[PDB]
Amino acid sequence: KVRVIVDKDPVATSFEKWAQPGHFSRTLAKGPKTTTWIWNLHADAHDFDSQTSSLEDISRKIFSAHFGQLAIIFLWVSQAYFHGARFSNYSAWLLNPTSIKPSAQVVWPVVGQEILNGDVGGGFSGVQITSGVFQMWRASGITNETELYWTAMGGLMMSALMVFAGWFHYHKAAPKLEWFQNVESMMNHHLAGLLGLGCLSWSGHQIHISLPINKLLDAGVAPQEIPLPHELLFNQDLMAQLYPSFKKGLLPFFTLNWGEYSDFLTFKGGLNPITGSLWLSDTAHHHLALAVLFIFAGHMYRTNWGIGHSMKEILEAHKGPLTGEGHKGLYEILTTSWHAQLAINLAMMGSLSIIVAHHMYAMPPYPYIAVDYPTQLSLFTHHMWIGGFCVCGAAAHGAIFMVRDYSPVQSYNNLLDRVLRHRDAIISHLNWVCIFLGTHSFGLYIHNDTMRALGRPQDMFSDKAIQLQPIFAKWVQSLHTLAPGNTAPNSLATASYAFGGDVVAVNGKIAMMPIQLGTADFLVHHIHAFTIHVTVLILLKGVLFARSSRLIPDKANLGFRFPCDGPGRGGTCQVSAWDHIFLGLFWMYNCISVVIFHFSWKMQSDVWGTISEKGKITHITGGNFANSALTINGWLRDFLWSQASQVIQSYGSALSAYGIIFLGAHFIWAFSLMFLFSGRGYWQELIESVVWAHNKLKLAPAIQPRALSITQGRAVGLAHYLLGGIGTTWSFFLARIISVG
Amino acid sequence: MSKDLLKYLSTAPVLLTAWMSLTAGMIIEIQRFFPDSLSF
Amino acid sequence: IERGSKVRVLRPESYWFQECGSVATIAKGGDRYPVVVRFEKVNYAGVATNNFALDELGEVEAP
Amino acid sequence: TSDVLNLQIPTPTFGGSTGGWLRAAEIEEKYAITWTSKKEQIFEMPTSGAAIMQKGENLLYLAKKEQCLALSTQLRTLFKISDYKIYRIFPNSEVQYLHPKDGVFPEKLNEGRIGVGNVGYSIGKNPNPVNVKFTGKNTF
Amino acid sequence: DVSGLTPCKDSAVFKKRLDGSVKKLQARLANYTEGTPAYLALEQQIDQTKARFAKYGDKGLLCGADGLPHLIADGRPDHAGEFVIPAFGFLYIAGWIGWAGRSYLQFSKKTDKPNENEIIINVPVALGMMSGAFLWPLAAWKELINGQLLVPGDEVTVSPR
Amino acid sequence: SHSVRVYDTCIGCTQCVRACPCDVLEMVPWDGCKAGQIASAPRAEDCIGCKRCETACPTDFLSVRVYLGSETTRSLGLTY
Amino acid sequence: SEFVKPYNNDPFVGNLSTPVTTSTATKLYLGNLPIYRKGLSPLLRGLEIGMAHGYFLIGPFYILGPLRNSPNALLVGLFSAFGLILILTLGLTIYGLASFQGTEGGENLESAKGWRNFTSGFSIGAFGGASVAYVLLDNISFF
Amino acid sequence: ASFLPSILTPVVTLVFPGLMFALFFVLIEQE
């Protein structure tokens, strides 16, 4: 049966193993003899399966670690709400959202940093924020600072409860592996219980507190006069005054006259003209429908009662001629190995973050967020980066599963075996695809540069010399534009105005606009595809060739991350799947960097801007994307050089912090190249010279210093490279968008 | 505050963070009380 | 030089060249490097022990 | 033992793979490894995939001595099979018995083995390169 | 005075820099109303700016054609406060630091578990070493004379030449 | 092919031979060592140069030592 | 069922007998292509391959070439095709010289005489195919 | 004269280096 079964008091509570630093691993528990011990203590900190063999113990450690992480996240939600409560201008922004710059952080006057408390409107001096939390709270219906303070206190209480839960579920009552492996009940409760009831509760909150407050705010009622949420929750007369369908009660729900709730449950679509964002009635209907969908989906898998599915049987039933045994063994793999689950979950989380980035900008969900140009850019770019990082984590943990938890006795003649048996074909064909795609997509840019420099615009791959029109994307956009009448008759507007339709604008600034697709869009989209394909090549090759290869038949024996297998065979450098991830992180970094550059330039040139009373559409850069994005010279001039002005000229102003971070991120990006290009042998010899200098003075340490390991040097170089590049883009985008928008 | 927790607080990273915290606070307070000292 | 004695290594290629180590064992005949010197300073491989000959060691302190 | 192979032993049951020899083991040199198993059971090939070693005699073809030795280490340390023999097969069909050349694994000493590549002084006593400059020898 | 620079107190460019910063602060002051925390903070900040400029004028710093203070580091005692006195202060502090580290290392090397003492610092004696390193110049000189500072090189690991 | 050499600082601990993935090394009788055995390389032509012998050697400096040299199909370890 | 089995009943050869690799369609088309066709001499193999490649090589130069919007577009395309074919037959000749150094068998693509016959066939065929495509493209209004 | 750029630049920077590449490849693929 599916049952609760836990062991009591499995681990005592004591600081003795806090004092003992390297207790978790057998080798580290001995104590230090070189400084590599210190690094390995951090490297192997959360490698539970290397520490303990018991899957039960690994699961318990993971469960309590999840609790600790949730405590951290609750403290983070608390910081956001509390800073909005105290050190902010949320009330001023709520009164006047368009002119007030949102700010929820204040520096102290010590060393001249007080200038960073710039003019953000509302009689408030502080650092402008770009996280969209102000718009989030306006959507939620928060109109006072006491609400922010009290939800911050609640978040702190939840963080304390989560720390307590993490301690309790490891030191007092830890579950068993039998409890952990109840995947069917876990799926049922996560679908119906977590997602379904979360959506249902949020739909109720929206219907009862967000629709009335936001409708009154859009009407013009100032926040002081707004009736409080507790009054709105039970005052059915006021809710009938606002939405007439509420006077009918819940009888139109229990009887299936659901059409009576059409006023506050809508399928309007488009964007609200007042706030320039999605209709909150639409969002409430959305969350209600999703609650129903998830509760329906969560009753699929078997439990104590006879009804339900078995994922084992579902997988085993799917086997084809070209797949042999098919999905046999995958249920056991995913029930026994945590790394496989981590790989799948990280992949889907990253793809979801990217999909979130794509959806939020095209369909602004929060009020006055579309006009808040820094918020849109910041959220899109952030979620893109998080998505790429999660995808590479997925690849890494797939490789870890392959190295450690793979077994042919289990996975004989199944899909995993059949994939490993033609990995060579897979990687060779992806290699050809990568070469072809990169050659075409980048050589079109290079051709454009060559012909422009040769003074031959008639020979360009431009919109007027040799057109490469995205006919299929244009067709899909046309279908979406015509959808509200023909293929979605109950929809009163298009899902997103990017496909087509009217120009939504709040005050002078433009919320959303149709985004045209031409030759430059074709080129940059194929560039995106090329970058994604090369990243997939690197990561998939690392995962497939983690067990072994033609170069190293016994690569699994060496481990997951190892420096090499010597200079033999002409050199076996970075053969490890870890090193494959190390290289794929550079490539997802390049991919996401080009994606965010495309987003920034396209939205600045074609979407964001201002519209006058007559209708004079004036964009930030002036539509230069369509004619300058055809060349790498144009990318270097009209995007990087042109928009770096607001960063470099920021000294002596509130964005001077962005200027400093621009320089510092540049410095760290360059500092990374030392680790990336150099090698441990030189550094160990230099440390030997320095150690002689210290020993001459009788102060050479007992913990002998050593150059960093090879894998560690690669990791440090990659981390510094990513930090420097991402910080450079962060400062550049934030300074540019805050200055111009 | 058993001997084990005192030992843990005596560990190298905790001590580094504590001492550099005190040092940074000392420098910042000296800046507040004697600000803009581009000289002696 | 003598078991339990502190001896300075004089082998040029040793990680412990011109450094002290405690003698733990001296073997009989056979071994071209009968003395077994034990150190506390692990070399790059990790070992803290090695076999040396009597000519490659110079006593600094006796047992 | 001897420089000969039956060349008809039943092979492990394997569904094929892309990791095998490619237009060079048949032109330059192939390798074979033959062992005996007490039970028909599943193992991991050096080339990617899973195969079933048969009950009793088993024979496998490969392209690298490293691949053969890796499979041998797998067989020894998982299935405790320690009767494997490794052969090199030339395009002219000569067969050369390589790994257990004395009939016992190299890690165990034998009385008849003679030393190849042995130096009578410590490592830090080789001549300098300037001494062997413009001579065909090397400093070891 | 020297290098063609002039004292900052009698520097027209320095006075204009002060006036320009003051005008910038007063210009940004227009957004905030009288008596608010932002207004009072800006008033404090402008007072601080004027005090800083007056202090630089009084200290005797030399201002160049750019109108910024230029520190003369050549060893003349007229401009000792620019480098020489801060230099001595840092040298004393850094000596204190290094002597505390070295003396604690000398203590720890004699401990039964020096490797573990390196990570886990014996704080009661570490504080003592830090306090006692205040007199490092005499202590280092004493160790030099007694010969217990610089180990003979015939006792330090050296790579094959 | 690479040149594999063994010096008389060998202690006969027979770990290079076990680390060997190509059967290049083998223990032979020897009078010098207490264990009575010394590593030797009668099959240097099969050497690839991964230096697992050097990694596994516990001597203060390596009794077994490999010098990379003329390359071959076997030394490169090419399946083709 | 199982449509992926060992290649030629050899599990240890680096190949798989997939439908793509070993289907009757693939076998028929490949074996009937000129380079594999039974009974064709090396001269005819080269001839067929040459005409085949020469017919299509003119097109990219004709339409996407620099002088596409010029009265001599097709002439420039034909000249470009001739140049590219000259480079290709030079590549063929040097490949034969480098590969089939010492050979006397002949009548075989893997021999010097056979590869030379193949290269001659390719060269003449490709020149003729470029010219034929020129002639057809001049009179494309016929169709 | 102004003839000579046309005569010499393509001869020296298409024909001669292509022939040199052919010759070097053929020579390095001897024996």
Ligand code: CLA
């Ligand atoms: C190294 C010196 C040098 C350099 C860099 C150049 C460069 C050039 N010459 Mg040349 N040229 C040179 C010496 C040089 N020339 C000399 C001394 C003469 C004889 C007086 C000429 C006569 C000459 C004529 C008549 C013409 C050029 C032209 C050109 C241009 C096209 C390339 C060409 O086919 O020319 C090479 C033509 C030759 C007849 C071969 C000259 C042989 C020289 C001396 C070889 C020197 C080799 C060098 C030192 C090292 C080896 C290089 C390489 C193998 C690694 C180019 C700018 C053309 C032009 O004006 O285009 C706009 C053109 O029509 N050149």
Ligand code: CLA
């Ligand atoms: C989980 C989500 C959720 C929640 C919590 C609620 C909650 C509510 N909805 Mg519903 N509602 C939801 C989703 C949700 N809705 C959705 C998705 C829809 C769209 C289909 C609707 C559509 C809808 C309509 C159209 C209406 C409501 C209304 C109500 C009220 C019903 C009262 C009731 O049945 O008492 C249940 C009672 C019991 C189970 C018995 C126990 C009683 C306890 C002990 C009383 C406690 C009272 C309290 C603590 C003190 C109040 C004191 C006061 C002086 C302030 C309540 C505020 C009505 C309303 O008031 O609208 C404003 C109403 O007309 N809802």
Ligand code: CLA
């Ligand atoms: C759900 C998310 C998730 C989870 C649960 C895990 C879990 C794990 N990962 Mg990780 N991993 C993730 C995401 C995740 N990963 C992602 C997104 C990536 C892609 C980059 C990776 C890539 C990855 C690799 C390549 C490896 C792991 C490994 C591991 C294991 C040990 C990690 C450890 O002990 O680190 C302890 C923590 C640290 C060492 C600290 C890391 C600090 C980073 C590098 C820098 C932080 C910078 C900071 C944010 C900004 C600084 C600002 C500056 C101004 C100061 C563990 C099972 C290892 C493993 O399984 O080995 C067998 C392993 O090799 N992971």
Ligand code: CLA
């Ligand atoms: C600008 C820098 C740069 C360039 C040009 C490349 C190029 C390449 N990388 Mg990448 N790479 C880079 C930086 C770069 N990388 C960095 C910094 C890293 C370290 C993290 C890596 C790490 C890395 C890995 C690990 C992998 C790649 C891959 C590839 C290949 C992708 C296939 C492709 O599109 O090829 C086509 C060529 C281009 C796009 C270059 C321009 C081509 C145009 C058409 C010019 C043609 C000129 C003409 C024909 C010849 C010269 C004329 C005359 C002089 C004779 C290709 C060789 C992947 C691969 O193998 O792909 C199959 C792969 O696995 N790279």
Ligand code: CLA
């Ligand atoms: C215990 C303290 C200590 C002492 C006395 C010295 C002494 C020396 N170091 Mg330094 N060094 C130290 C720690 C120390 N080092 C550490 C922790 C590192 C690793 C980052 C280095 C890395 C290092 C390098 C790479 C080099 C030196 C060099 C030198 C010499 C020149 C002085 C200098 O420029 O310092 C430079 C100082 C640093 C780079 C940073 C020092 C780190 C902190 C600030 C001090 C440590 C104090 C410690 C925590 C005290 C604990 C005691 C307490 C418990 C009571 C000199 C022999 C140079 C040399 O060989 O010159 C001949 C040289 O090239 N050192």
Ligand SMILES: CC1=C(/C=C/C(C)=C/C=C/C(C)=C/C=C/C=C(C)/C=C/C=C(C)/C=C/C2=C(C)CCCC2(C)C)C(C)(C)CCC1
């Ligand atoms: C029907 C139809 C069609 C077609 C379609 C198709 C052809 C499809 C295909 C599809 C496919 C072709 C699919 C696939 C899928 C896949 C999947 C779903 C996968 C999964 C995976 C996993 C889950 C994994 C995991 C892992 C990792 C990652 C690492 C480690 C290992 C493991 C295994 C754990 C069309 C269009 C005509 C239209 C109409 C209808």
Ligand SMILES: CC1=C(/C=C/C(C)=C/C=C/C(C)=C/C=C/C=C(C)/C=C/C=C(C)/C=C/C2=C(C)CCCC2(C)C)C(C)(C)CCC1
């Ligand atoms: C399989 C397939 C495919 C493909 C196809 C193709 C690839 C085609 C091609 C086609 C072509 C590509 C055709 C061709 C034609 C040709 C021609 C029409 C030629 C002619 C020639 C001539 C007439 C020549 C002559 C001459 C001269 C003039 C001089 C002297 C020598 C000679 C006699 C040679 C597809 C995917 C689509 C679909 C599926 C199936």
Ligand code: SF4
């Ligand atoms: S530099 Fe690193 S990867 Fe290259 S051979 Fe040496 S250890 Fe291996």
Ligand code: SF4
């Ligand atoms: S020192 Fe090296 S070669 Fe000698 S026995 Fe030990 S591992 Fe073998």
